[PDB]
Amino acid sequence: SALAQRPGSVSKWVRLNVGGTYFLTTRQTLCRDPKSFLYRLCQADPDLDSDKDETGAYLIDRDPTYFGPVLNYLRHGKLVINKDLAEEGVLEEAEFYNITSLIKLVKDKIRERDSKTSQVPVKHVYRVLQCQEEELTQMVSTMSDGWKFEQLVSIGSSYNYGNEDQAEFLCVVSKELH
Amino acid sequence: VSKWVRLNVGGTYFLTTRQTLCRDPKSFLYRLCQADPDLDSDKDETGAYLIDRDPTYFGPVLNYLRHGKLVINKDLAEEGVLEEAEFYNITSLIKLVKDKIRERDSKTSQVPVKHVYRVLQCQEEELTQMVSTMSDGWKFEQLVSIGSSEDQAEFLCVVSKELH
Amino acid sequence: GSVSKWVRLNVGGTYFLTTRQTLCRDPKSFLYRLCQADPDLDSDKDETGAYLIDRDPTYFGPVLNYLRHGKLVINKDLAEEGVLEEAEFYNITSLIKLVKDKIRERDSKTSQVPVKHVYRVLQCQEEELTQMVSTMSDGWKFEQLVSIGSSEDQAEFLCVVSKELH
Amino acid sequence: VSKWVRLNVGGTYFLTTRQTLCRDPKSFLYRLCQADPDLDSDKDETGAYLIDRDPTYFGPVLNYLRHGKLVINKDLAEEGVLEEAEFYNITSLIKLVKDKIRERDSKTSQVPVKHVYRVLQCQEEELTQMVSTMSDGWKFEQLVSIGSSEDQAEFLCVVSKELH
Amino acid sequence: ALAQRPGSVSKWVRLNVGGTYFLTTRQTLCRDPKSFLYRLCQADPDLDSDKDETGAYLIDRDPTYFGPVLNYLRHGKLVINKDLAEEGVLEEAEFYNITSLIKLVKDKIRERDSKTSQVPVKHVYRVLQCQEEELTQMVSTMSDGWKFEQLVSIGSSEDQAEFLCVVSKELH
Numbered sequence: 041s042a043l044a045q046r047p048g049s050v051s052k053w054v055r056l057n058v059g060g061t062y063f064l065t066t067r068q069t070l071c072r073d074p075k076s077f078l079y080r081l082c083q084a085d086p087d088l089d090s091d092k093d094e095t096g097a098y099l100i101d102r103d104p105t106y107f108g109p110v111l112n113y114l115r116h117g118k119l120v121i122n123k124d125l126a127e128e129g130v131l132e133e134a135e136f137y138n139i140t141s142l143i144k145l146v147k148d149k150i151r152e153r154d155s156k157t158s159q160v161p162v163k164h165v166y167r168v169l170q171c172q173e174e175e176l177t178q179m180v181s182t183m184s185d186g187w188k189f190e191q192l193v194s195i196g197s198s199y200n201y202g203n204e205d206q207a208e209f210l211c212v213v214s215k216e217l218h
Numbered sequence: 219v220s221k222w223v224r225l226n227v228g229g230t231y232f233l234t235t236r237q238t239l240c241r242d243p244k245s246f247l248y249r250l251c252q253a254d255p256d257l258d259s260d261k262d263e264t265g266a267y268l269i270d271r272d273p274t275y276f277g278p279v280l281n282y283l284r285h286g287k288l289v290i291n292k293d294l295a296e297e298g299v300l301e302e303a304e305f306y307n308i309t310s311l312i313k314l315v316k317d318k319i320r321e322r323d324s325k326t327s328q329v330p331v332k333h334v335y336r337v338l339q340c341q342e343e344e345l346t347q348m349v350s351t352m353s354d355g356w357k358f359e360q361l362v363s364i365g366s367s368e369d370q371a372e373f374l375c376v377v378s379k380e381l382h
Numbered sequence: 383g384s385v386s387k388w389v390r391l392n393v394g395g396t397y398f399l400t401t402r403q404t405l406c407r408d409p410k411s412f413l414y415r416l417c418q419a420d421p422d423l424d425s426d427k428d429e430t431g432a433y434l435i436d437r438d439p440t441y442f443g444p445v446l447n448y449l450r451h452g453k454l455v456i457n458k459d460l461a462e463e464g465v466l467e468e469a470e471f472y473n474i475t476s477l478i479k480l481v482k483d484k485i486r487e488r489d490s491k492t493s494q495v496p497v498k499h500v501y502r503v504l505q506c507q508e509e510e511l512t513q514m515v516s517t518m519s520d521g522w523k524f525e526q527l528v529s530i531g532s533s534e535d536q537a538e539f540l541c542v543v544s545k546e547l548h
Numbered sequence: 549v550s551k552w553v554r555l556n557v558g559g560t561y562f563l564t565t566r567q568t569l570c571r572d573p574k575s576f577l578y579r580l581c582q583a584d585p586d587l588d589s590d591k592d593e594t595g596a597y598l599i600d601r602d603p604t605y606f607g608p609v610l611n612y613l614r615h616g617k618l619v620i621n622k623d624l625a626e627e628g629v630l631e632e633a634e635f636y637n638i639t640s641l642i643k644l645v646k647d648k649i650r651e652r653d654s655k656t657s658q659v660p661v662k663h664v665y666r667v668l669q670c671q672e673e674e675l676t677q678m679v680s681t682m683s684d685g686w687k688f689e690q691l692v693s694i695g696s697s698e699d700q701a702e703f704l705c706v707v708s709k710e711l712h
Numbered sequence: 713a714l715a716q717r718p719g720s721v722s723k724w725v726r727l728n729v730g731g732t733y734f735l736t737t738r739q740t741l742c743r744d745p746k747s748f749l750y751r752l753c754q755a756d757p758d759l760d761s762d763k764d765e766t767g768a769y770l771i772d773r774d775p776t777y778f779g780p781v782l783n784y785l786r787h788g789k790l791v792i793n794k795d796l797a798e799e800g801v802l803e804e805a806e807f808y809n810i811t812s813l814i815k816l817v818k819d820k821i822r823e824r825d826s827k828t829s830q831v832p833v834k835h836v837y838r839v840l841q842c843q844e845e846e847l848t849q850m851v852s853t854m855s856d857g858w859k860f861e862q863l864v865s866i867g868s869s870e871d872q873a874e875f876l877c878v879v880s881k882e883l884h
Contacts, residue, residue: 052761053762053764053770053772055731057233059232059233059234059280060230060231060232060233061731062731063730063731064728064730064731064770064772065730065731065772066772069772090221091221091222093222099222099233100233101233101234101235101237101238101284102284103277103280103281103284103289105277105291106289108774108776111730111774112774112800115772115773115774116803116807118799118800118803120774120777120797120799120800120803121797122776122795122796122797122800123292123794123795123796123797124291124292124293124795125291125292126289126290126291126292128287128289129281129289129291132281132285132287132289136285158382159382160354160355160379160380160382161380162830163354163355164357164358165350166349166350166352166358167346167349167350168345168346168349168350170346176839176876177838177839180837180838180839180878181836181837181838183837185834186832186834188832188835189835189837189861189862189878189880190358191360191361191862192862192864192878193361193362193363193864194363194864194865194866195342195363195366196366197865197866197867198866198867198869210345212349212358212361214358216830216832218828218830226399228398228399228400229390229396229397229398229399259387260387260388268388268399270388270399270400270401270404270450271450272443272446272447272450272455274443274457275455292458293457293458293459294457295455295456295457295458297453297455298447298455298457301451301453301455305451328497328546328548329520329521329546329548330521332520332521333523333524334516335515335516335518335524336512336515336516337511337512337515337516359524360526360527362527362528362529362532363529363532364508364529364532364533365529365531365532365533367533370508371508374508374511376515376524376527378524392563394562394563394564395554395560395561395562395563425551426552428552434552434563436552436563436564436565436568436614437614438607438610438611438614438619440607440621441619458622459621459622459623460621460622461619461620461621461622463617463619464611464619464621467615467617467619471615496685496710496712498684498685499687499688500680501679501680501682501688502676502679502680503675503676503679503680525688526688526690526691528691528692528693529693530693530696531693531696531697540675542679542688542691544688556735558734558735558736558782559726559727559733559734559735559736589723590723590724592719592724593719598724598735600735600736600737600740600786601786602779602782602783602786602791604779604793605791622794623793623794623795624793624794625791625792625793625794627789627791628783628791628793631787631789631791635787657884660857660882660884662856662857663859663860664852665851665852665854665860666848666851666852667847667848667851667852689860690860690862690863692863692865693865694844694868695868695869704844704847706851706860706863708860
């Protein structure tokens with residue numbers, strides 16, 4: 041019944057037993073955000089000397105898989121998620137441990153990808169080129185790079201009017217905008 | 219008399235508290251929680267309880283029993299979850315697990331987001347203008363004459379939009 | 383009337399625990415010899431008790447799952463071809479069927495057949511044109527439309543619309 | 549020189565039988581199948597042989613030696629297999645993997661699925677029919693009036709078909 | 713009591729990176745004299761307290777990104793699997809200070825973000841002209857690779873012609 045704490049109670053290197061798969065990290069990493077459950081470890085908390093085991097690991101009834109990204113964040117202040125981990129189980133772990141900074145960023149991600157699908161795609165831009173027939177072949181083959189043919193449409197077919205008169209063709213052409 | 223319980227699930231070991239293995243008291247797991255003299259021999263030398271089931275699927279099961287949510291990693295197949303939910307007898311989860319299966323099954327739809335349309339009208343003079351100026355999201359499908367000889371039309375013109 | 387219940391497998395390095403009884407679902411399979419406690423494999427047992435098996439464990443999961451619950455559970459990363467080979471070596475006829483249905487299921491899914499279309503020509507005068515196109519039922523896409531004279535009564539326009547047949 | 553042999557590729561143990569490692573006698577591994585006096589420093593406490601390489605990619609290789617097939621999990625990089633194949637020197641497997649890599653590279657590059665076209669003809673009355681009764685797989689492209697105000701043709705109508 | 717450890721004067725070096733043990737040879741870690749690792753390579757005294765109860769040196773970083781690092785060293789080539797986050801490697805490269813790696817790791821991060829290639833693979837366009845009678849023919853005896861686009865009528869009520877016809881062709 042605690043006479044005093046245990047020889048490792050302040051060690052540099054701390055062993056966590058996050059739900060089964062043991063983790064390794066330096067006590068001081070845990071002192072990054074001083075409102076987290078884990079900040080207790082950082083400060084030698086004597087309430088934890090019954091949730092430590094045989095190896096002197098700290099125990100944690102939570103999911104080792106999801107924990108990683110968290111422990112990394114504490115290590116360098118960055119969000120790392122492999123492409124198969126499910127970000128919501130990262131949220132649930134961010135809350136449980138209580139890392140106010142992180143939780144903001146996870147829920148940023150969660151929107152960022154519910155955004156990522158949402159779009160109206162490729163804001164196409166259109167242009168109406170006009171020419172006579174005598175240069176139709178020309179106008180079509182000498183379009184600019186990237187632009188596509190959408191439609192063209194006659195404007196009067198069956199000889200002219202007088203010693204002058206309106207062009208003869210339109211042509212609408214498009215381009216992407218990625 | 220320990221708060222903690224080790225589980226040898228198919229081979230790999232799992233750590234968790236007596237407290238988490240009784241959130242649903244009809245389950246198999248509940249007996250462990252209850253310090254049962256009928257699952258004593260099903261412990262190994264290091265103390266764990268032995269459980270002839272694949273663990274890679276037993277993950278999400280144990281998470282639910284912790285925070286009451288469903289957490290499935292993109293690659294893990296739901297169908298393998300369900301079997302473990304049903305083997306362990308955790309009805310509330312099974313409900314959730316079959317809702318995921320119906321959830322993502324119905325996504326085979328090649329049934330697209332319905333395009334709405336509009337039929338614009340303008341004269342020749344403001345046609346180039348009309349086209350280039352075109353508002354946000356609207357694509358161009360076709361235009362047509364109404365004869366280039368009382369206003370009525372000079373040109374008509376169709377255009378589409380997505381509505382997801 | 384003995385009950386030596388549990389047994390450890392050293393499949394390819396990574397251990398496995400499963401009950402004697404699980405390994406007696408297909409009595410024509412290699413694993414049935416482990417189940418009967420065969421003296422001819424006492425020298426394929428290491429120190430820790432387990433049975434040595436010179437095969438890939440990443441794929442031996444699905445195979446052992448079938449013998450627990452009689453179903454085919456395959457994660458999306460694991461390639462089914464590897465489940466087949468293991469299924470053959472261990473010799474689980476029932477399973478070798480199931481695994482070979484999966485492959486033909488999927489390796490004939492990647493064959494992408496053109497979508498069929500149904501096509502109709504409507505016909506609507508100028509006034510009621512706008513109305514026609516913007517009201518269209520679900521699925522029906524636009525295709526073309528043509529003036530029939532652009533200038534008595536008749537019909538003013540026609541129009542082709544179309545719809546997937548998935 | 550027993551029967552069973554333990555490796556230790558990159559710090560994650562492998563188990564296999566002498567017999568699997570003699571398949572190719574011009575590969576590094578072959579020395580571990582004979583019982584080499586000069587690869588006995590590189591044994592550890594557990595008796596296993598030590599190998600400074602990456603055990604992710606080593607699996608496939610070791611598989612090929614057991615049953616002569618190139619099995620790969622979908623996520624893993626073939627380029628990493630190639631490289632581990634080469635190191636160990638299995639000329640058979642380097643060929644199989646350099647097949648796999650050519651087999652899927654330049655995947656995203658098809659010869660332009662050629663198109664064949666027709667030009668259907670009809671009159672006022674059967675118009676609706678011609679379109680509504682179109683052969684399997686042909687697509688609509690364009691239709692044309694021929695002078696709308698003793699019979700002749702009234703409507704000409706182009707149509708395509710993909711040739712996969 | 714004898715003399716020395718059947719395994720002290722050893723080529724082999726155990727790391728306990730973030731909690732999952734890695735094995736490698738002294739000769740491997742030394743590939744870049746500038747890196748953090750180069751020190752454990754050379755059995756540094758200012759690290760003899762980051763070793764554990766069984767000889768492996770300790771590193772507070774994430775193994776699941778380490779891998780690639782320890783590979784590049786072994787064989788001077790960048791390997792990452794399709795599911796690992798390329799960004800997370802950059803950090804583990806920058807912490808260890810492997811300069812040649814950090815030029816590669818970033819070049820891949822460009823390489824695939826630098827790949828919105830909706831870049832319209834080009835099309836050349838032509839304008840054909842044929843009468844009514846030989847209008848079915850043109851369309852079908854049309855050359856290899858060309859597609860149809862649109863066609864436009866020219867005056868229905870002298871031999872010349874009666875229809876234009878636009879037709880595309882891809883430029884792969």
